[PDB]
Write a protein that binds this ligand. Structure first.
Ligand SMILES: *Cc1c(COP(=O)(O)O)cnc(C)c1O
Ligand SMILES: *Cc1c(COP(=O)(O)O)cnc(C)c1O
Ligand SMILES: [Cl-]
Ligand SMILES: [Cl-]
Lengths: 457, 457
């Protein structure tokens, strides 16, 4: 890539999550990715970067997969697009639906509805929750409960579910009818609480919110098995059962937001099987295709599906569709993705190498004076940098310790993201990462963290 | 296609806009499209159908385009995906942004933000409208005004903008802060009003709504140049200027929803140039890629962009992104699409053959006893069937005249959609349609309408 392209970028391309002015003026320099293979990408300067974030928790089978590119091409040649309205389909979308339900989804899942992004999938979730209760004659039972630091999308309603302020700022979010309970981050639990007591606290807090709101008004609770963008927050021991006990008591649906965790990410089929969650609805995307083509999928459980089915006899077809729902080339990409996941036992690899990565991180970083917590689960991990480790005092956000450490990794040839609203270095590498590659990742992160500690301590 | 596939479809595939139970039980039969070429698709029975709806107003360059399939394949091989966050880009997305602004968008457009569906693009629009007013210190100026029969998406907020009840039913829509003004359908204007007086009426009605709500609370107005899913409602003479005069008077932004009308559909670059609209923000999708890959694009005018740019100096990066924003394969598909549109002068073809189609429809259907109105603009057209043509009395909706006529076309080998909330046969054929093909379309529609008139009159 090329200096004219960068002029045209600054003039006309509005990027996601990009400082509008600094990009436009060149102060935030652009970067063009020209190719990629395995766990590495190549920029316009010829730099090859080790990408320990797999794009955005999404390039799970690794880059450069000619198999998937050929599967997309064959579908694009045969039939790039027709709609899936009024019972229309491609072979590919039918096959994909059966394979998701049969090979990947938890017990009791039935139907799959397709979109393009995780955000449109959670938008679909909110509609299904309202529909379900309206057709069952419970018009007041509508509120959705999310969590502080949850990430669930970047729309109005989906941004409201999101529990990170940057997705609310100047958008007047959260909307009415979305409430937030605690982030279950045990490291930051009230002083004196052991893990069990903190879980007990989290459950009581949720219960009190349901009771304050009126249980007859509360429809669903949404949660990622492990919180991703909110900073790699692993649920404490017994958390999910404690939460599900509260929800069951007041007939609240569970939406498992599996956009990160599904399709081998935590070393399991999805996060729900790993973390003892029994969701009524599931959101997926990212790893569904390994980002080779855009696709999202809402997985509907038998209970909600049966009400949708029976209600349709009275109500006609549900008023829901996106033009590109079931897009054939996106289904073809997904099937090639699932083929590779299965054939190369990548889920088992993510368990093993993810266990290893987390271990090697603890070894390199536990007791490091800049690091307050090392954490993770499967092929997700994080370091959270703190000012006083034992008192759990963070740095002031303006010191930008997290962004600095991310930047220092990038100088040293590795991509690891500085997470929002804190000083946190996140890792979400391709699920095909080797143990050797994991050690490379830890080695570079360690050099980066050491560099920044020198500057800031 | 195949009987096992249909079993798996009924068991596991939740379709957009599909009677859940009747599909699942087989009463609503499924159909698998196995290929397509030109203006025709092929189903699992070998039937070749003339598709006068171009999928969903979207397959604009026609089916079977190996050029686009190869362009997708070449990008999928080189770099299927990386993100476009924090100033990252592909060559393709940069080129696309410059070409949209330079060759297709109206005067005064600057930046392009990418999504996957028209609905996520209007979701982005609502965020930009709220941001704009919040950063300008106008926290009350937030309400959006749409229109009865407008179609703007199938989410919560985007469904609220939509002015068709089927997208509201059991979803508790429209949300607060979305209001609807009149559908400007001159055929159904209050008795006694000539066209000029009706336009005058529509403007006063909008003004009264702004005044009732408080102009300081009203942020934007959204409208399709010609209303698509709402039934091919062409704006009356002087309508758009009358509306823009009201909006300008109270500093209300104009969002042009060009998801149907953009990229040659009305025989012009976009509907805005054709219909004297000067929008602050523009929504696009469908014809942006001719559906070869999913993509949406929000086109931001200089006025709104300049506030976003300057606000970022104080506020940091805007909290907005979708993981697949700028998806490379989708950009590659778009560029091949635009290449073909330009190279084959398809916009000029849409003007000519669309003019012809509308003329031939008027000839075949004006005075037909089942038909209350023939209407259209460019390569969009509709027949609206009525019980009393002069008194403008419709059939009762339960007679399903529209669906019947659609079904009768389909028996005769042609796809033309029965539009929601009325008895309306819609046409939106590929922009590459020939005059001969247009005459085929009119001929089959005429036989279909005659058949249904025999049954119902
Ligand atoms: C990325 C993400 C989403 C939203 O997905 P998009 O494709 O960016 O809309 C939703 N939930 C979780 C947990 C995510 O990580
Ligand atoms: C189809 C359509 C949309 C929504 O597009 P999706 O891709 O289906 O979300 C929005 N506005 C108009 C005018 C449309 O025709
Ligand atoms: Cl495995
Ligand atoms: Cl032309």
């Amino acid at each position: 890539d090329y200096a004219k392209l960068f002029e045209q970028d600054r003039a006309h391309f509005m990027h996601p999550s990009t400082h509008a002015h600094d990009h436009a003026s060149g102060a935030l320099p652009g970067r063009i990715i020209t190719g990629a293979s395995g766990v590495r990408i190549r920029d316009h300067q010829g730099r090859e970067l080790l990408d320990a974030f797999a794009g955005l928790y999404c390039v799970n089978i690794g880059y450069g997969r000619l198999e998937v590119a050929d599967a997309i091409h064959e579908q694009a040649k045969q039939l790039a697009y027709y709609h899936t309205y009024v019972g229309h389909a491609s072979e590919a979308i039918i096959e994909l639906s059966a394979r998701i339900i049969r090979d990947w989804a938890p017990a009791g899942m039935k139907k799959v509805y397709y979109g393009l992004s995780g955000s449109d999938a959670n938008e679909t979730q909110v509609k299904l929750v309202r529909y379900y209760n309206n057709v069952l004659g419970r018009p007041q039972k509508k509120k959705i409960i999310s969590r502080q630091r949850g990430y669930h999308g970047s729309g109005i309603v989906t941004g409201s579910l999101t529990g990170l302020a940057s997705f609310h700022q100047h958008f007047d979010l959260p909307v009415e009818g979305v409430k937030h309970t605690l982030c279950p981050h045990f490291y930051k639990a009230p002083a004196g609480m052991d893990e069990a007591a903190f879980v007990r606290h989290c459950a009581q807090e949720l219960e009190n919110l349901i009771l304050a709101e009126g249980p007859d008004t509360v429809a669903a609770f949404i949660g990622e098995p492990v919180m991703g963008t909110g900073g790699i927050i692993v649920p404490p021991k017994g958390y999910w059962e404690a939460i599900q006990a509260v929800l069951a008591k007041y007939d609240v649906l569970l939406i498992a937001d599996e956009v990160v965790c599904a399709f081998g990410r935590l070393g399991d089929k999805m996060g729900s099987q790993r973390h003892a969650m029994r969701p009524d609805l599931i959101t997926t995307a990212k790893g569904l295709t390994s980002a080779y083509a855009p696709l999202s999928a809402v997985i509907v459980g038998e209970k909600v599906w049966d009400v949708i089915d029976s209600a349709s006899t009275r109500e006609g077809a549900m008023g829901h569709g996106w033009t590109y729902s079931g897009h054939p080339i996106c289904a073809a990409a997904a099937l090639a993705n699932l083929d590779i996941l299965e054939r190369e036992n990548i889920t088992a690899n993510a368990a093993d190498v993810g266990g290893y990565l987390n271990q090697q991180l603890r070894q390199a970083f536990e007791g490091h004076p800049l690091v307050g917590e090392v954490r993770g689960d499967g092929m997700l991990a994080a370091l959270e940098f703190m000012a006083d480790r034992e008192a759990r005092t963070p740095f002031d956000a303006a010191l930008k310790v997290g962004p600095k450490v991310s930047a220092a990794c990038l100088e040293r040839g590795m991509i690891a993201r500085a997470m929002p609203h804190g000083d946190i270095l996140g890792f979400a590498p391709p699920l095909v990462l080797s143990r050797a590659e994991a050690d490379e990742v830890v080695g570079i992160a360690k050099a980066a963290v050491d560099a920044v500690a020198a500057e800031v301590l």
